[PDB]
Amino acid sequence: FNKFCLSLSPVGANCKFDVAARTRTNEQVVRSLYVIYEEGDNIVGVPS
Amino acid sequence: FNKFCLSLSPVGANCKFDVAARTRTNEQVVRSLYVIYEEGDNIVGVPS
Numbered sequence: 001f002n003k004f005c006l007s008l009s010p011v012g013a014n015c016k017f018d019v020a021a022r023t024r025t026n027e028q029v030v031r032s033l034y035v036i037y038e039e040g041d042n043i044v045g046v047p048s
Numbered sequence: 049f050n051k052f053c054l055s056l057s058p059v060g061a062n063c064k065f066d067v068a069a070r071t072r073t074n075e076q077v078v079r080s081l082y083v084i085y086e087e088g089d090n091i092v093g094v095p096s
Binding site: 011014 | 077078079080085
């Protein structure tokens, strides 16, 4: 990414993730996490 | 338009505009402005 931010308020958000409580059977959504980003190459995620 | 309204609350909104702070380089969104409208011909925007 060139930019990547997480937010608890949908202002400028580009997309959102669904936060859920996963139990023995059913998985249910409790909150949404907002994501602001710009595709690019300055920032790289890594496994470590 | 037959109808055109601006709102600060997304109830009935048909679409929204993105309000941003444009600086020397980066442009970033601060607020959203909601638009309620019906296509038609009763109301015309004008340059003056």
